[PDB]
Design a protein around this ligand. Structure first.
Ligand SMILES: OC[C@H]1O[C@@H](O)[C@@H](O)[C@@H](O)[C@@H]1O
Ligand SMILES: OC[C@H]1O[C@@H](O)[C@@H](O)[C@@H](O)[C@@H]1O
Ligand SMILES: OC[C@H]1O[C@@H](O)[C@@H](O)[C@@H](O)[C@@H]1O
Ligand SMILES: OC[C@H]1O[C@@H](O)[C@@H](O)[C@@H](O)[C@@H]1O
Ligand SMILES: OC[C@H]1O[C@@H](O)[C@@H](O)[C@@H](O)[C@@H]1O
Lengths: 859, 859
């Protein structure tokens, strides 16, 4: 069994006879091509187009997504590999409409970005030099001429901001290709074409090992019963001997198991039953260890040749518990018998060009989530199924994955061919990802049903066609998302639950309800753009989407913009604001002004955008956690970015944390105090614990004047049950303030375990722009702290949302966007590779009071 | 492991306090009850109501379906069975809404006729004597008050002919109960209430064997790979040893297999892989042997107790092949790589009271099918899942079963509770029936989609409700019939195909199409009531329903009717005509008069009704077979009867063959000649062969005058491919007759293999009533042939549709309803228990010419 990768001498050019051939003669000629990669990124490297992320260069590359491309590479095949009984070419990823030829002969037709294509090539292969050609066809150019003739176009995704597709007639719906490639409201339009995954020549004789699956039949504390399933493709009938070694988390051997069999031409499965007594189970982050066992299977074929395959797996039971109670019907993920309140966010692709994403970026994205006390990411259906390495790290860090199939919201066609194409995709992805313990849920799509029921364009569309046509289309969706995907999961990964659509009730009834299933709440930010306190009025059984937009870090801003661009209304900044067809800055400023009024300069604009977002999500996330067991999930939109620009992320494209992420670590803390004041002057205080043991705690309440005087101080003992929320307070403004000036008063709430401070929240009684915040003087002291530095900040007065930065000097901080209490020192750890001397000169310290001072009036 | 059956001292009465208790005081008091049984049949045995099958007695028993009933029995449990760690009561069948109490305490609530109800009873079981009580509630009485409050009633089945349910508001839809119990257009309204299957006390200690499934993973000529799957319920953790012995069709040893494991509390699976080299596969009738292997698993638990379970199964591959071709998309059952043209009929329950059906009747029903050269029966969804024994015989005789789940056409409710109740029903039936090799296909329902799309009442209903409510209802159906049933089959019986609805395209598109999926064609008989020659103009890929009605055997008529009742329009005969709300005799007479004019007496009416049906179905089935590969299925409606009366059956309630069944043996013959004359005077001649080898054949065509003179004779050679139909002729009336009188001329077509005549068809050129048929004289000669008799008939002239009978003396005939050619003797075998003398006295020989002679004019 050999497997050589064709990752070398590829080149690419425009298919001859296109008008782009005249416009870009250098693209008509052969240019270097990278595999895996995209022609887009090949063009960039070749200086044919500039970096589309920089300033307003996005439009300069759109022509590549409208053109057809021709890949070519030459490779040699040994006399030894040609000897072999089977020689196959394997394509892990072709994006998307591909026509492959070998030595001029037809080899393969492909039409799914997410499928693996295996093809017998032995008869077409020559001794030595071979010519492999791949032609990739623009999905827009291929589909639109057909689409223009259809009685209707299906409701889709986003219109082209470049007008190269008609309004409300999107081709993206009809092709199995990453939805975000066509542009989304936080990313550019990069309709990629490319051999975006590996290409291999594989050769074997008697048997080819197609897979190993550790099927968990039942897992609890007492035992785990599993079945090692081995898929074997055979060319001829003959004996095989299978040996299975099992290693525990500590690396010691658990047991060896053997199985003899006779395989026959075609597919064969060999199953080895394994029972592990008192298993060291895999838990998500915050609920134990991420223990994993190693299963090593070696297969001796009829020729006496041995092949080996390995799976690292975590033993875990997964239950999607939906039981009736006072709040309707629950929706809670239960891991190893433990109801886990989901704390996390929505995960999108890490780049507009997915093939160039490094392992380091994959890991730091998940590491970011783990650091903010998250236990789950939802891999949103508008993106692409992630790299193997990504799921490995998720397993390792204990970040649960809510895995959407890659449907982003468009209404799918109901033709059999589309369905069967998608089925094969679903089968291969589920087979690929199932042994990852972190993958705990499969979901049919993002927002398809709730769009059909609530979005104006969908509602109008379904009522415009004949009722019989509506039935056909609705039947197609119910079959694809309710039958097909569900069957694939039930067949190949049967120990994990399936979910038809997010948000929804698994087709039991309507989508996006508050008393059944999950919810995407967007009446804050979107729609009527309600104030953020409205979050306190919305409590679904599980909140899988909600969010606020903000700008990325100033370093990231300076990365895509010039000094003359530094204005939210500049052409460059408007390009990087993708919400509401480029008019998103109006919505962003709406929310900023409500709390902070008019920003006095651009750096303040960025800072205040991030504060607006952070404080807003803090309200909703704390409330959801405090509402347990009414709610059992919080996944905000969104975690990360594909590109430098404005978005709902908490971490920008370059991995830099926004104020939101620092806040997320706090409101997602395992033990947390929630002190939330509603628009009726009532502040509800709750003690939240994700411990599986009782928390014998103390909680404090101190009401302060901003001139430093204490108005009141109070401390109580509290016994907080495991896995629960306990309301310990509900105070009116009068009960807290008592005739004191709300513009000059604030409250400090703290949760304690013994002498250890676990959580703190500072509450205010008026929008920040109306407050009389003190002019803080913040002393900073440095000292050598290992290979990093210890930075201690001490403010004489209250200092709000202190933000530390270092110009263009790169450094990471253990904490940021924090409140400083009068005379109370805070020490943060500074990790950098710069010397202490420049860090001290470059240090910038910003606070809210200072930022709001000297601000102009709102328009 | 003990399992005692409560099949003894049951009694039953009306639940006290009903108005029926006053009307029927004898039913208010305790009366003997039979278990299994129905309270209806208990009332008959007790002489409280007369036999509802007799004359017009049907209405006198309707009150039992509107009442609530109370079963009661006493039984003793020794101290030895109380020893056991688990003691359970098991109800295999409760019809339907049941409330069970034990020694005065609530034990079980049941609401599905088709589920098995297991309950722990150990804590409630007493020393010695125990009191078991079961209350059954009328589904009509229970549901209607709820239904009357509903905004709408779902489209259902048949209205009550007794007005005890409102029109178009049927309770039958909302309850899991055999649809035909509520009355159908060929059966009485018997809303049965009863403990209609066994009740057991079961007891066990460490391990209980919940099931054994021989899962066929891949089967071909070279090998069969299977996995013996054993379900074990354990009360505590401990070791087990499993032994599997495999015996071949000859009873000899194939191999023994062993497997040790440790079971844990709850459910445990133990799988033993078995590969059988050169398996002797199971073939359907006419395509080989019905070879079956025996799998015997014995399980020794930790206590050392050995339990044994056994499965007899046939190794078989099943494929539902749907490939694109010239006629659209095919639909064919492929068994062991052989495309089988399905030849058979639709199977309904054998009785209005299913619990009293004997094994002999189950067996003779399937034997009937086998004898008429059938290879498939469809167990129609309006009935009930059959007895285990029934499927056993089907396995034995090689009659394939198309198994509908028991939904008859009503539009189901979309509530979660109904769905989950039904899901459990499906799981239990699929688990019970899967190891029967004869079960080759599962089907969601009968006619639900085509009704929804084509029946006027459904169309009006779905357009009357709110479109969002319409979407809800359609979503409910698509989930139940497209997801739930499909998942159950894919999970528990995964080597056989599933079909969403008959007729349909498995939800790919519209139902009942001609170029995709299967069809129920009823424009002949039903709807516009087209002439039978219209059958030649309809050619679907698979015809799963079609038919013509007729009366049962004269002996059967005399069984339910008095001499004063012998008139199609009498009150008694109308009661036994259930088509079109009792006005069915008009539709029957329409078709009869078309071909034969007005019947001269009642016996002629019966005979001609059977000829009309027989000749009509002969046209369609022959046409369908001759059209191969355009069509690949012929299942006519219907095979059998639930009750004595008029229906589309070929075999009446007492097992007596109609003319149709005798004709069916001919047109389903493995080699058949089809000579079909259409409404344009064109006779197409086809040679059909179901052989797996080529047929080198000879076929003849002779044109005859009614006076015996030969007009023309022709013989031609033909090489008929394996598994095909070949057109060898297409003659106009002019080419055949040539100025000869069509009323005085006929044609004889014959298919031969060497000197062996394989099939014959006699063609006419005018309806029988216009013909000048000769006055035949038919000589009859007897002779002893073992314990039966050989009866030889010789006609001097042409004798059409000769029908042999013996008054009320019972006898069976090897052939009947045949044509006699001049001077050509035919010998049939007579099986009876009467002496020759009485057979000779009772013998009646009827032919078409004699019957048509002296007939009065049509009204
Ligand atoms: O032109 C491309 C289009 O071709 C038609 O046949 C559609 O059925 C799709 O397969 C596709 O969107
Ligand atoms: O529409 C509300 C949000 O929904 C999410 O699923 C994504 O599509 C976002 O880009 C969008 O802003
Ligand atoms: O009570 C009769 C019927 O009443 C309603 O609850 C229905 O939904 C059914 O579940 C039930 O059988
Ligand atoms: O369609 C209304 C009713 O009457 C006839 O059409 C039959 O098909 C019934 O099964 C149906 O329920
Ligand atoms: O609807 C026409 C026919 O359909 C079949 O499914 C059965 O229900 C028959 O009783 C009926 O006559």
């Amino acid at each position: 069994m050999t497997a050589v990768t064709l990752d070398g001498g590829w080149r690419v050019r425009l298919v001859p006879g296109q008008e782009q051939g005249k416009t870009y003669p250098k693209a008509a000629a052969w240019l270097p091509a990278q595999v895996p990669g995209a022609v887009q990124t090949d063009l960039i490297a070749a200086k044919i187009v500039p970096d589309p992320f920089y300033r307003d260069n996005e439009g300069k590359i759109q022509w590549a997504g409208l053109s057809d491309w021709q890949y070519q590479t030459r490779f040699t095949v040994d006399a030894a590999t040609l000897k072999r009984e089977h020689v196959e070419l394997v394509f892990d990823g072709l994006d998307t409409f591909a026509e492959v030829t070998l030595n001029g002969k037809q080899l393969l037709s492909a039409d799914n970005m997410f499928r693996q294509w295996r093809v017998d090539a032995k008869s077409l292969l020559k001794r030595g030099d071979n010519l492999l050609e791949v032609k990739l066809y623009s999905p827009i150019k291929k589909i639109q001429p057909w689409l223009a003739k259809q009685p209707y176009a299906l409701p889709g995704a986003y219109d082209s901001a470049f007008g190269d597709e008609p309004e409300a007639r999107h081709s993206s719906t009809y092709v199995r290709k990453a939805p975000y490639n066509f542009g989304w409201d936080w990313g550019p339009r990069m309709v990629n074409a490319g051999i975006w995954k590996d290409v291999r020549v594989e050769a074997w004789d008697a048997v080819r090992v197609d897979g190993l699956h550790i099927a968990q039949q039942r897992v609890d504390a007492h035992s785990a019963q599993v079945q090692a399933q081995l898929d074997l493709q055979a060319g001829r009938s003959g004996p095989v001997q299978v040996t299975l070694d099992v290693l525990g988390p500590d690396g010691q051997k658990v047991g060896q198991f053997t199985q003899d069999a006779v395989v026959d031409p075609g597919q064969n499965r060999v199953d080895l039953a394994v029972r592990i007594a008192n298993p060291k189970r895999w838990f998500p982050a915050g609920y134990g260890a991420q223990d994993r066992y190693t299963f090593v299977a070696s297969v001796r074929d009829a020729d006496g040749d041995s092949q080996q395959i390995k799976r690292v797996t975590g033993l875990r039971s997964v239950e999607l518990r939906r039981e009736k109670d006072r709040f309707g019907k629950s929706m809670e993920i239960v891991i190893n018998g433990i109801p886990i309140f989901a704390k996390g966010a929505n995960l999108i692709p890490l780049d507009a060009f997915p093939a160039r994403v490094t392992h380091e970026r994959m890991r730091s994205t998940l590491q970011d989530a783990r650091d903010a006390n998250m236990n789950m990411l939802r891999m949103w259906g508008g993106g692409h199924y992630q790299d193997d390495y990504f799921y490995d790290v998720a397993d390792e860090l204990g970040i649960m994955i809510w895995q959407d199939f890659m449907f982003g919201g468009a209404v799918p066609p109901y033709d059999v061919e589309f369905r069967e194409n998608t089925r094969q995709e679903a089968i291969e992805q589920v087979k690929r990802l199932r042994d990852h313990p972190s993958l705990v849920l499969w979901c049919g799509n993002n927002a398809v049903q709730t769009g059909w029921e609530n979005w104006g364009d969908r509602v109008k569309f379904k009522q415009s066609v004949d009722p019989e046509e509506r039935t056909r289309i609705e039947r197609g969706m119910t079959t694809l998302f309710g039958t097909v995907f569900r069957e694939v999961v039930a067949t190949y990964d049967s120990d994990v639950p399936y979910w038809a659509t997010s948000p929804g009730t698994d087709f039991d009834g309507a989508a996006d309800q508050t008393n059944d299933g999950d919810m995407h709440y967007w009446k804050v930010w979107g729609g009527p753009a309600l104030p953020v306190t409205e979050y306190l009025n919305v409590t679904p059984r599980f909140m899988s989407e909600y969010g606020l937009q903000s700008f990325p870090d100033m370093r990231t801003v300076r990365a895509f913009a010039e000094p003359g661009d530094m204005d939210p209304e500049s052409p460059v900044m408007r390009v990087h604001q993708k919400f509401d067809k480029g008019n998103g800055n109006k919505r962003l400023m709406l929310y900023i002004r409500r709390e902070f009024g008019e920003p006095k300069d651009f750096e303040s604009f960025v800072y205040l955008s991030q504060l607006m977002q952070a404080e807003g999500i803090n309200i909703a996330a704390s409330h959801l956690r405090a509402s347990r067991p009414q709610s059992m999930g919080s996944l905000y939109w969104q975690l990360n970015d594909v590109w430098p620009g404005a978005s709902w992320s908490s971490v920008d494209y370059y991995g830099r944390w926004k104020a939101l992420h620092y806040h997320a670590r706090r409101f997602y803390a395992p033990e947390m105090i929630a002190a939330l004041r509603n628009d009726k002057g009532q502040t509800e205080v709750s003690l939240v614990s994700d411990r599986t043991t009782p928390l014998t705690a103390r909680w404090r309440m101190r009401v302060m004047g901003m001139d430093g005087k204490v108005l009141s101080k109070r401390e109580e003992k509290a016994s907080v049950n495991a896995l629960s929320s306990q309301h310990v307070g509900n105070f009116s403004d009068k009960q807290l303030l008592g005739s004191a000036d709300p513009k000059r008063t604030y409250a400090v709430f703290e949760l304690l375990d013994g002498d250890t401070l676990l959580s703190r929240e500072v509450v205010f009684f008026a929008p920040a722009k109306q407050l009389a915040l003190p002019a803080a003087k913040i002393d900073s002291q440095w000292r050598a702290d290992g290979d990093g530095y210890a930075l201690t900040l001490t403010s004489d007065t209250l200092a709000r949302e202190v933000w530390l930065s270092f110009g263009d000097v790169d450094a990471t901080l253990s904490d940021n966007a924090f409140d400083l209490l009068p005379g109370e020192p805070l020490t943060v750890r500074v990790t950098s590779k710069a010397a202490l001397a420049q860090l001290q000169s470059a240090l910038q310290v910003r606070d809210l009071a200072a930022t709001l001072a000297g601000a102009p009036p709102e328009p």
